[PDB]
C-alpha cells in the first residue's frame, strides 16, 4: 500500500527547486525522518516538466549504493507528487567550499575518492549523471556524500550498446565540450565534471568561470583555464588527465580501460577503496 500525505508530519523546507520543494518529514508510524520532494501536478504539466519527474523516479529506482540519495517510496494525491528520499542532514557540498574556501589535500582526496567510487557504480549500471556539481553532492550526518538530482540523468540502453545521449542538460560551468560541440553526452562527460569539481575543491572556484554561460562555453571548448599557485601537484596531474577535450582520452573512461586506472592514480595512493563509506571522513579544512 502506497504511503499518503497523512502518514507524515511535515516540518521545515530543506530547499526549493524551479518546480519542486523538499520538506523534512517524520513518518508517524515509525518516527523515521525523510526528505520529501513535492511537485504540483498542474504546474509540471503546464511547464512540460513531466518527463523530468518520471526520469528522476526511474533512474533513482535503479540505484542502491551508499553514496547516493535513496528513493524509498513515491506516492501522489489529487494535486501533488511525492518522492520519499533519504535526508542528507548536512546539505550541499558547495556551501562547505564557500565557507572554508579551499579543501586541504586529505579532504580533497577523501571526497574525490567517494565521488569516484559513486561514479564507478553509476557507470557500471550504464547511467550518466550529466549534472555532477557540488550543489548536487549532498552530505549526510556522518559527512559522507549523497549524490542527488537524477531528473537530468540518462540510462543508456545495454541492448543497443548506447554510448551517447542527446538531451541538452546540465550546468554551464560543468558541461563537457562534447555536449557543446557534438551535441551529445557520454559517461566520460561525468569525468569532465569530476575534473572541474576536484579543481574547485582545491582552487575554490571551478576552472571555467565567467559572468555568463556563453563566455563559459567559449572557454570550455578551447580548454581555457589555468591552475593557481600551490595547487597540489598530484591533484593537478589528475585534473589534467580529466579535463581533456577528447572524451575518449579521459582517465576513467571506457576507452582508457575504466575505473581501475583512475583509482590507481598516485593522488589516491593512500585510499582504501573497499570501505570508504564506513571510514570516518577527515574533518574539514
Ligand atoms: N535528500 C535530501 N536531503 C536534504 N536536502 C535535500 C535533499 N534533496 C534535495 N535537497 C535540498 O533541496 C534543494 C532543492 O532540491 P530539488 O531537487 O527540489 O531542486 P534543485 O535540483 O535544487 O533545483 P532545480 O530543479 O531548479 O535544478 C537542493 O538543492 C538541496 O539543497
Ligand atoms: O510513483 C508513483 O506512485 C506514481 C507517480 C505518478 C506518475 C505521474 C507523473 C506525472 C503526473 Cl502529472 C501524474 C502522475 C509518481 C511519479 C513520480 C514521482 C512521484 C509519483
From Swiss-Prot:
Keyword terms of this UniProt record: Acetylation, Activator, ATP-binding, Cell junction, Cell membrane, Cytoplasm, Kinase, Membrane, Nucleotide-binding, Nucleus, Phosphoprotein, Serine/threonine-protein kinase, Transcription, Transcription regulation, Transferase, Ubl conjugation
Residues recorded as bearing N6-acetyllysine in the entry: 230
EC number: 2.7.11.1
Residues of the active site: 131
Claim: Cytoplasm is one of the keywords in the record: yes
Post-translational modification: Phosphorylation on Ser-167 in the activation loop is required for full activity. PDPK1 itself can autophosphorylate Ser-167, leading to its own activation. Autophosphorylation is inhibited by the apoptotic C-terminus cleavage product of PKN2. Angiotensin II stimulates the tyrosine phosphorylation of PDPK1 in vascular smooth muscle in a calcium- and SRC-dependent manner.
Induction (UniProt): Stimulated by insulin, and the oxidants hydrogen peroxide and peroxovanadate.
Keyword match Transport: no
Outcome of swapping residue 203 to V: 3-fold increase in kinase activity
Modified residues (Phosphoserine): 167
Segments for region (PIF-pocket): 39-83
Function recorded in the entry: Serine/threonine kinase which acts as a master kinase, phosphorylating and activating a subgroup of the AGC family of protein kinases. Its targets include: protein kinase B (PKB/AKT1, PKB/AKT2, PKB/AKT3), p70 ribosomal protein S6 kinase (RPS6KB1), p90 ribosomal protein S6 kinase (RPS6KA1, RPS6KA2 and RPS6KA3), cyclic AMP-dependent protein kinase (PRKACA), protein kinase C (PRKCD and PRKCZ), serum and glucocorticoid-inducible kinase (SGK1, SGK2 and SGK3), p21-activated kinase-1 (PAK1), TSSK3, protein kinase PKN (PKN1 and PKN2).
Listed name of the protein: 3-phosphoinositide-dependent protein kinase 1
Species for this entry: Homo sapiens (Human)
Taxon lineage: Eukaryota, Metazoa, Chordata, Craniata, Vertebrata
Annotated gene: PDPK1
Amino acid at each position: 500500500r502506497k504511503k499518503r500525505p497523512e502518514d507524515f508530519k511535515f516540518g521545515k523546507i530543506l530547499g526549493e527547486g524551479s518546480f519542486s520543494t523538499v520538506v523534512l518529514a517524520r513518518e508517524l508510524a515509525t518516527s523515521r525522518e525523510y526528505a520529501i520532494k513535492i511537485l504540483e501536478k498542474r504546474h509540471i504539466i503546464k511547464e512540460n516538466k513531466v518527463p523530468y519527474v518520471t526520469r528522476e523516479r526511474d533512474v533513482m529506482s535503479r540505484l542502491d549504493h551508499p553514496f547516493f540519495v535513496k528513493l524509498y517510496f513515491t506516492f501522489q494525491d489529487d494535486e501533488k507528487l511525492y518522492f520519499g528520499l533519504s535526508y542528507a542532514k548536512n546539505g550541499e557540498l558547495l556551501k562547505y567550499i564557500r565557507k572554508i574556501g579551499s579543501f586541504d589535500e586529505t579532504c580533497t582526496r577523501f571526497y574525490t575518492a567517494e565521488i569516484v567510487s559513486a561514479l564507478e557504480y553509476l557507470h557500471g549500471k550504464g547511467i550518466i549523471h550529466r549534472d555532477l556539481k557540488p550543489e548536487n553532492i549532498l552530505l549526510n550526518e556522518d559527512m559522507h556524500i549523497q549524490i542527488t538530482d537524477f531528473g537530468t540523468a540518462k540510462v543508456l540502453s545495454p541492448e543497443s550498446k548506447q554510448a551517447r545521449a542527446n538531451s541538452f542538460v546540465g550546468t554551464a560551468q560543468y558541461v563537457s565540450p562534447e555536449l557543446l560541440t557534438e551535441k551529445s553526452a557520454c559517461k566520460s562527460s561525468d569525468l569532465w565534471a569530476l575534473g572541474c569539481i576536484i579543481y574547485q575543491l582545491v582552487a575554490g572556484l571551478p576552472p571555467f568561470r565567467a559572468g555568463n554561460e556563453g563566455l563559459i562555453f567559449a572557454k570550455i571548448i578551447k580548454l581555457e583555464y589555468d591552475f593557481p599557485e600551490k595547487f597540489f601537484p598530484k591533484a593537478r596531474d589528475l585534473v589534467e588527465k580529466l579535463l581533456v577535450l577528447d572524451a575518449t582520452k579521459r582517465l576513467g573512461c571506457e576507452e582508457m580501460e575504466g575505473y581501475g586506472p583512475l583509482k590507481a592514480h598516485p593522488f589516491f595512493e593512500s585510499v582504501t577503496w573497499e570501505n570508504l563509506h564506513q571510514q570516518t571522513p577527515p574533518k574539514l579544512t
